[PDB]
Symmetry: D3
Subunit: 135 residues, 6 copies
């Protein structure tokens, strides 16, 4: 089966300047129906196709896939190659993780954090999805 | 099940300077066999791993996944951080969408468009794919 | 079904300055159990979310998904837009391939190579994965 | 997926002389996990391999597969050919039904009833089972 | 997937006195969508829980599962143990077959025939069903 | 997936006069590729549509589904309603069992036995089959 959530925060953009991972509003999968199933696995893709980060010390952004128990399943990020980008551009980002649905976890969600004091931004379509299969 | 299509236009590269989304030829999924199936869902991934864009006003490129009915399921894009890039580099791009196959849609395809008067280019492998599953 | 392999080489980072595609160690899928099956297909995703490349001639890195017979199923790469990047940044990379499991193939793996004498680097989480399906959905 | 329940009432045999269908205790399937799923169907098999019936007017027994909401999905039965059987023999019985899981039904279960005043008996292995599949 | 058909011919009971197999109307499965599919197999169950047969020479009935291309996949039947049953009773009957869906088969259906000049009867619920699966479980 | 075996012993009919269960040759399922799999379950149907039994003390026959590791999963049987049947009629028989494939089970198979000194006979089509599924459907 497929589980999927998307956002498209054009009218009210998202941002963070947190050094620690915080939730991206709306980018959460409800896996309730599949909880406590030791024979199922989720293959999870976080798709942030159009982020950017503002700042003046080689800015960038980090993303993670995290369970509701705080288990970080995967992480990665983008950064620019100049200390002060002229106009920080859009650096497409995708991240893939897996999770055994044996546990009571009912939500798998996206988080983000900054780097070197940046502010990370999302103002357009992004998604999180999973394919759930028998082991 | 899996549906899949790819291109590799090395010998005849693709380009667009269209401000409006237009088809990327060859990046189309035929989901005819699954149309009119309210119990099926497609999870669609557009993979353009090596695009670039030329131009002199912070060039970049936009991509979308669209149905044959004109439904835009997903969109996004890349851009450079310099007004006039020294040599516009390759900025990998992936986009993930979903579609309920309840409708009569028979084609799910990739589109592209420019930004700020750029020209977008593909000269190498790219793909569009879907996983089709029963809703439960 | 799902097949999955990840690496996270923080403590011992990986690098290559190979102009030819070479294996990324640890990013290999065993599909032996599914070989010689007209009836199955694999959708393979290589996810290198945080690579970079060092160099002074528009550096970058290339990646491929390949079979154990050396067949290149997919390829692509990233490059910087400056000749000598001030500090080569992280350029997320994903690649998607398909393989009919009709043949006698046993492994699907990731490879990488450099460009214009660069050195490509991975020092953090990366994965390769596949969804394997029957061509008939029942 | 498979759902299954069995009984083996050797020490405490089961019997009914009920003219109306009543439950066979223990031959019930919990399908709660699948309720409200318009894209799932259950194929249900009731297997009573060794029943008999006693009585004096062409005895026999009837069986049904029913939901918790009282819907009878299938029915059938066995009877003897003689008015008062010399010694009521074992007459194997199987019944197959189908049920869409679109509704809120939580239980699919077996029932039995008599015919012409008989008493129906089970004193050994019997089962109810279902295969649950996506419609597509 | 599941394919299923049932009848319940209470008002207009079905009967046959034919020694050769003839179709039981209404007990047919459309497998058109699955045909020409070497990767798929059907497991077919014919359930006739309440038949009887009338006659005066050890009556009974036979049933088969067959394809639209004339192929007999399974057969069997019931008979009574008395030459002239006092009142021919109900003798439950089930039959299970398998079929590869590699061929251009459109339909899998039930047939019946008599024995020793009997008349076979169905006047209540009966069904034919199949579970269709990939030969590979992924 | 589906596993299936059938026999059609017209030319050399099978019989048993054994009070103890013995294997019915040819009615065995190989589940070895699915064994040691706690996430898989088999639903097993034994279909003997046309058996009979000879004898003079209320004859009949018993059938069981069993594993190679001596587990009797299901059993049942038919009997006639007369001490000395005028002519041993055909009494259709089906039996359905379940098995978790978590164990090192290699085989699931049919057995038969007599009752009260009878001889049980099979001279036509019979089958044993299983549907194998993951415990959780997706
Ligand atoms: C080249 C550049 O940096 N431009 C800045 C302005 O941003 C652009 O503003 C326009 C609207 O005038 C538009 O919003 C652009 O984004 C759109 O396209 C991208 C894809 O490239 C995404 O799909 C967005 O969701 C779309 O809205 C936007 O440019 C994009 O963002 C900037 C930050 C760069 O990454 C650029 O390469 C991108 O193409 C900017 O406008 C302000 O910020 C934007 C995001 C929006 O909120 C506007 O309403 C704001 O005024 C401006 C002022 O800060 O500065 C530059 O000109
Ligand atoms: C550094 C740079 O910008 N170089 C320009 C030339 O492009 C390079 O040309 C070589 C052949 O001489 C080769 O085609 C390079 O691309 C190959 O590698 C990329 C991955 O990096 C892809 O896999 C391509 O499909 C491969 O062919 C090419 O560099 C790449 O493209 C440029 C646009 C940058 O994005 C760079 O970072 C990339 O590495 C360019 O050559 C002309 O354009 C290319 C695309 C090709 O059509 C050549 O045949 C053309 O001559 C040249 C003139 O336009 O300008 C620069 O030197
Ligand atoms: C801005 C820059 O290029 N800095 C260089 C140093 O790299 C940074 O070092 C810190 C630790 O001091 C940290 O390792 C940074 O990476 C972390 O963040 C990225 C995501 O951005 C990944 O998640 C990593 O796994 C994390 O560890 C690292 O910066 C990152 O890498 C460089 C190459 C750029 O791509 C930058 O934009 C990234 O943010 C660098 O340190 C040395 O190299 C790093 C990779 C690490 O191995 C350190 O232990 C090394 O000392 C330094 C010396 O070469 O040069 C710059 O200062
Ligand atoms: C031939 C006959 O009718 N026998 C009667 C007795 O029943 C048999 O008793 C033995 C024990 O001595 C045994 O229970 C028999 O059943 C076993 O085999 C059948 C399969 O044929 C089932 O698997 C049962 O679960 C098994 O236990 C039983 O015969 C069977 O039942 C009768 C009604 C007929 O259908 C016959 O053909 C069957 O083979 C009977 O014993 C009493 O009733 C049985 C059911 C049991 O409760 C015993 O404990 C009781 O003593 C006896 C007295 O009423 O009368 C006959 O002898
Ligand atoms: C004991 C016997 O043989 N009775 C004969 C009559 O048949 C019974 O008639 C009633 C009338 O409402 C009823 O139809 C009985 O069948 C019902 O129960 C069985 C299960 O046992 C099935 O589910 C049927 O679908 C139900 O309708 C019926 O008895 C059954 O059939 C006979 C042939 C035997 O097998 C018996 O053991 C069964 O229980 C018979 O009535 C006529 O025939 C029946 C089938 C029906 O068509 C009636 O409309 C007819 O009048 C009567 C005259 O031939 O002869 C006996 O009394
Ligand atoms: C000769 C032959 O093979 N005939 C087949 C049918 O079997 C015979 O069926 C009649 C039906 O009235 C009867 O049941 C026969 O057995 C009895 O009478 C014979 C002498 O005629 C002997 O005295 C037996 O001891 C009696 O029980 C029966 O023949 C026996 O079985 C067959 C299968 C051979 O093994 C044969 O050598 C035996 O003599 C057969 O009928 C079907 O099977 C029988 C056992 C019974 O269940 C019937 O109800 C069945 O319809 C038929 C269809 O299979 O094929 C031939 O006609």
């Amino acid at each position: 089966s497929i589980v999927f959530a998307s956002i498209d925060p054009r009218s009210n953009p998202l941002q963070t300047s947190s050094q620690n991972y915080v939730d991206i509003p709306g980018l959460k999968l409800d896996v309730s129906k599949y909880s406590n199933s030791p024979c199922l696995t989720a293959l999870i893709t976080l798709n942030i196709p159009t982020p950017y980060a503002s700042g003046n010390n080689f800015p960038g952004g980090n993303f993670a896939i995290v369970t509701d128990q705080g288990e970080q399943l995967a992480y990665g990020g983008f950064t620019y190659s100049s200390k002060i980008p002229e106009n920080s551009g859009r650096m497409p980002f995708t991240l893939v993780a897996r999770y055994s649905l044996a546990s009571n976890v009912s939500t798998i969600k996206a988080q983000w954090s900054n780097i070197r004091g940046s502010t990370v931004h999302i103002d357009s379509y992004a998604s999180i999805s999973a394919v759930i299969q028998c082991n």
